[PDB]
């Protein structure tokens, strides 16, 4: 029930790497995963991976395992049930095939069968 | 796992609800000098607060229960949240805040629903 | 990708639509959960239905889900004018990821 | 209607018997200075008298009950009054006076009728 | 026969087990001067020790029971004695000594066996 603001549209060229931010608020950051999903021109949407700010655990698709740098900071507590977090994302071998809009998404629940499901999303970032 | 007294304070309402006896044990035992009267005042306070919770369980037909099911249907005015977004999302701490206002109302509904239930059982056995 | 949807379907105000979502035995359906997402063009998505038939918070009771041994269905009862968008499905388990679908554009022109 | 604490004191035994939780709530909460020791003595007295009534309900198999049905058949020596001339004629105040003598006897009958009932249930489940 | 308070102390465990209410009655009533504070300290001590036994009965699903049957199977490590050589041979005094070590273990088993039993009953009534 909070915002997940992201970075700006940083357009580079193939070969380089790009780091996109995702600063959270209005909710306990360490209680939900942070999913990363992209919708490029050439395919539809593709799920990249999520990371658990609490456990530090990371699970990402084999199509992006050897490309994605997925790290998180540690929440700065605001109130008892509110904090402010930050999630980072990078890509290694960047090309023009990877041009699209990228988002971060907060997990759906804290338990059950839909724990990590991308429920609360950011706004998007335009790549190369 | 054994988390300890209030160990599941930050866990979800479903997780903590399996560790009820943990918090139930230490509610009565624990986890004319100055200290003499200071301790006696605390020993009486612990009993009074304990019997008040037991008194409410008794007049709700829940005496002896840790998880007790009732007859009062959940008014969505109290909280219009889904079942899966409560027991697997919220912590009992958050829940007690969101139901702060309506708590006194539920406590009355659970009372007459028990005096009418046993009044009905007195008629079911009048034959 | 492997999760083939319903290409494209049209509709009309007051009526109900139905989007398919099927794939091979490797990503559908009896051994996986199905989530549905309302995805405006390159913008902020919206979770509609998770775990086959369970609706997200704030989702209108119009939307309903159903999963068979072969295909999952998303119905949109009583079409309202603000429904024209692309709908994507995802196959997932508890400890996995979202295997998104090919998309289904829905038109309400009426 | 809500008559209040002891509101049905002058009403018939049947009417008052539907307003039991009213009197059950305020039995434990209410409706070294001089006052300090005077209040502590009262806080302990309230608990002792409460647990004594609860102790009797426990050894009668009535713990948690407001209306409790038993196995002791009503001896007409205690009161040879008809059912309709009691619950729709008398007040609990009058009734407590007419059964003043026989009250201690009934309290014993309700006790062994419970220790034999559970001794029997221990045999019913011995198979 | 009526043996009295602790009358069956030297009798067999089976005989004494029929005289439970005898010992259950006198556990709470009985069979700033010097005496004033000396008596107040005793009146509070009697309640605390009583509610502790009641607290254990409550979290074992035995609240209100004198003879209570459970789900914990008897580990022969605790005592490898035959049934007929216990209830018709031993006295509760001897028995409490032989089970001195294992008593704290049984008390925990009787607790989770109740929180899992009601957690199961919450599912049996979820339909
Ligand atoms: C404190 O707060 C945090 C944050 O809210 C809580 O962390 C969350 O706990 C819940 C439940 O404990 C987690 O949900 C479960 O998620 C697992 C998915 O994990 C699986 O997949 C991972 C990626 O592949 C993998 O890392 C896991 O492997 C183990 O090892 C890692 C090592 O890093 C360890 O950290 C993990 O915890 C794993 O133990 C694992 O393979 C999912 O499988 C669960 O679903 C099953 O169980 C539920 C019932 O609970 C059932 O309904 C399902 O059908 C399925 O059977 C479950 O969803 C959640 O992921 C955690 N993280 C979040 C929310 O960010 C923490 O529990 C709190 N602790 C306390 C004490 O309050
Ligand atoms: C919910 O509560 C309100 C008052 O708080 C009451 O008027 C209404 O009838 C209740 N609804 C249900 C379904 O109990
Ligand atoms: C309870 O009442 C107060 C009145 O000041 C209100 O501010 C608060 O929001 C209410 N609680 C809930 C959960 O709405
Ligand atoms: C009634 O009580 C008397 C003694 O008070 C007793 O002798 C008699 O058997 C009792 N009768 C019944 C029917 O219980
Ligand atoms: C109880 O005993 C006394 C003895 O003085 C007697 O006067 C009284 O009538 C008895 N009670 C009843 C209800 O008979
Ligand atoms: C008996 O107790 C021991 C430990 O005291 C335990 O290891 C064993 O499993 C128990 N056996 C049974 C049958 O409960
Ligand atoms: C309990 O432990 C002590 C350890 O000193 C031992 O001597 C005693 O025999 C044990 N009790 C039983 C019944 O074996």
PDB file of C-alpha atoms in Angstrom, chain E residues 25-104:
ATOM      1  CA  UNK E  25     -12.977 -29.000  48.008  1.00  0.00           C
ATOM      2  CA  UNK E  26     -10.414 -28.103  50.685  1.00  0.00           C
ATOM      3  CA  UNK E  27      -7.798 -26.828  48.220  1.00  0.00           C
ATOM      4  CA  UNK E  28      -9.193 -23.270  48.272  1.00  0.00           C
ATOM      5  CA  UNK E  29     -11.140 -22.916  51.551  1.00  0.00           C
ATOM      6  CA  UNK E  30      -9.581 -25.445  53.950  1.00  0.00           C
ATOM      7  CA  UNK E  31     -10.662 -28.402  56.068  1.00  0.00           C
ATOM      8  CA  UNK E  32      -1.210  -3.743  59.541  1.00  0.00           C
ATOM      9  CA  UNK E  33      -0.871  -6.037  62.550  1.00  0.00           C
ATOM     10  CA  UNK E  34       1.501  -8.998  62.684  1.00  0.00           C
ATOM     11  CA  UNK E  35      -1.227 -11.575  62.113  1.00  0.00           C
ATOM     12  CA  UNK E  36      -2.893  -9.233  59.622  1.00  0.00           C
ATOM     13  CA  UNK E  37      -0.028  -9.250  57.141  1.00  0.00           C
ATOM     14  CA  UNK E  38       0.721 -12.888  58.006  1.00  0.00           C
ATOM     15  CA  UNK E  39      -2.817 -13.883  57.008  1.00  0.00           C
ATOM     16  CA  UNK E  40      -3.003 -11.741  53.861  1.00  0.00           C
ATOM     17  CA  UNK E  41       0.204 -13.343  52.576  1.00  0.00           C
ATOM     18  CA  UNK E  42      -1.417 -16.764  53.043  1.00  0.00           C
ATOM     19  CA  UNK E  43      -4.704 -15.801  51.363  1.00  0.00           C
ATOM     20  CA  UNK E  44      -2.818 -14.704  48.241  1.00  0.00           C
ATOM     21  CA  UNK E  45      -0.563 -17.767  48.278  1.00  0.00           C
ATOM     22  CA  UNK E  46      -3.588 -20.093  48.319  1.00  0.00           C
ATOM     23  CA  UNK E  47      -5.089 -18.470  45.226  1.00  0.00           C
ATOM     24  CA  UNK E  48      -1.837 -18.482  43.238  1.00  0.00           C
ATOM     25  CA  UNK E  49      -1.178 -22.177  43.848  1.00  0.00           C
ATOM     26  CA  UNK E  50      -4.800 -22.985  43.003  1.00  0.00           C
ATOM     27  CA  UNK E  51      -4.844 -21.113  39.700  1.00  0.00           C
ATOM     28  CA  UNK E  52      -1.549 -22.752  38.690  1.00  0.00           C
ATOM     29  CA  UNK E  53      -3.146 -26.203  38.887  1.00  0.00           C
ATOM     30  CA  UNK E  54      -6.191 -24.813  37.075  1.00  0.00           C
ATOM     31  CA  UNK E  55      -3.930 -23.212  34.471  1.00  0.00           C
ATOM     32  CA  UNK E  56      -2.358 -26.595  33.701  1.00  0.00           C
ATOM     33  CA  UNK E  57      -5.762 -28.289  33.465  1.00  0.00           C
ATOM     34  CA  UNK E  58      -6.888 -25.569  31.063  1.00  0.00           C
ATOM     35  CA  UNK E  59      -4.034 -25.973  28.576  1.00  0.00           C
ATOM     36  CA  UNK E  60      -4.458 -29.757  28.715  1.00  0.00           C
ATOM     37  CA  UNK E  61      -8.124 -29.693  27.709  1.00  0.00           C
ATOM     38  CA  UNK E  62      -8.979 -30.906  31.208  1.00  0.00           C
ATOM     39  CA  UNK E  63     -10.586 -27.750  32.627  1.00  0.00           C
ATOM     40  CA  UNK E  64     -13.502 -28.887  34.763  1.00  0.00           C
ATOM     41  CA  UNK E  65     -12.355 -32.522  34.828  1.00  0.00           C
ATOM     42  CA  UNK E  66     -11.257 -34.560  37.835  1.00  0.00           C
ATOM     43  CA  UNK E  67     -10.456 -37.678  35.810  1.00  0.00           C
ATOM     44  CA  UNK E  68      -9.225 -36.583  32.383  1.00  0.00           C
ATOM     45  CA  UNK E  69      -8.203 -38.874  29.523  1.00  0.00           C
ATOM     46  CA  UNK E  70      -5.603 -37.649  27.052  1.00  0.00           C
ATOM     47  CA  UNK E  71      -3.785 -38.591  23.838  1.00  0.00           C
ATOM     48  CA  UNK E  72      -0.191 -39.025  25.095  1.00  0.00           C
ATOM     49  CA  UNK E  73       0.717 -42.743  25.012  1.00  0.00           C
ATOM     50  CA  UNK E  74       2.410 -44.058  28.133  1.00  0.00           C
ATOM     51  CA  UNK E  75       6.155 -44.348  27.565  1.00  0.00           C
ATOM     52  CA  UNK E  76       7.394 -47.478  29.352  1.00  0.00           C
ATOM     53  CA  UNK E  77      10.662 -45.663  30.111  1.00  0.00           C
ATOM     54  CA  UNK E  78       8.673 -43.618  32.633  1.00  0.00           C
ATOM     55  CA  UNK E  79       7.490 -46.749  34.445  1.00  0.00           C
ATOM     56  CA  UNK E  80       7.523 -50.321  33.113  1.00  0.00           C
ATOM     57  CA  UNK E  81       4.882 -51.492  35.571  1.00  0.00           C
ATOM     58  CA  UNK E  82       1.743 -53.428  34.743  1.00  0.00           C
ATOM     59  CA  UNK E  83      -1.673 -51.813  35.083  1.00  0.00           C
ATOM     60  CA  UNK E  84      -2.847 -54.210  37.802  1.00  0.00           C
ATOM     61  CA  UNK E  85       0.390 -53.705  39.784  1.00  0.00           C
ATOM     62  CA  UNK E  86      -0.215 -49.931  39.915  1.00  0.00           C
ATOM     63  CA  UNK E  87      -3.881 -49.140  40.596  1.00  0.00           C
ATOM     64  CA  UNK E  88      -4.248 -52.092  43.005  1.00  0.00           C
ATOM     65  CA  UNK E  89      -0.758 -52.155  44.544  1.00  0.00           C
ATOM     66  CA  UNK E  90       0.733 -48.669  44.824  1.00  0.00           C
ATOM     67  CA  UNK E  91      -0.253 -45.525  46.702  1.00  0.00           C
ATOM     68  CA  UNK E  92      -0.263 -42.118  44.992  1.00  0.00           C
ATOM     69  CA  UNK E  93       2.555 -41.147  47.348  1.00  0.00           C
ATOM     70  CA  UNK E  94       4.810 -43.920  46.015  1.00  0.00           C
ATOM     71  CA  UNK E  95       3.715 -43.199  42.440  1.00  0.00           C
ATOM     72  CA  UNK E  96       4.665 -39.519  42.649  1.00  0.00           C
ATOM     73  CA  UNK E  97       8.174 -40.552  43.700  1.00  0.00           C
ATOM     74  CA  UNK E  98       8.689 -43.084  40.909  1.00  0.00           C
ATOM     75  CA  UNK E  99       7.538 -40.580  38.265  1.00  0.00           C
ATOM     76  CA  UNK E 100       9.434 -37.661  39.832  1.00  0.00           C
ATOM     77  CA  UNK E 101      11.883 -37.238  36.954  1.00  0.00           C
ATOM     78  CA  UNK E 102       9.525 -37.753  34.015  1.00  0.00           C
ATOM     79  CA  UNK E 103       6.765 -35.500  35.366  1.00  0.00           C
ATOM     80  CA  UNK E 104       8.045 -32.350  33.647  1.00  0.00           C
TER      81      UNK E 104
END
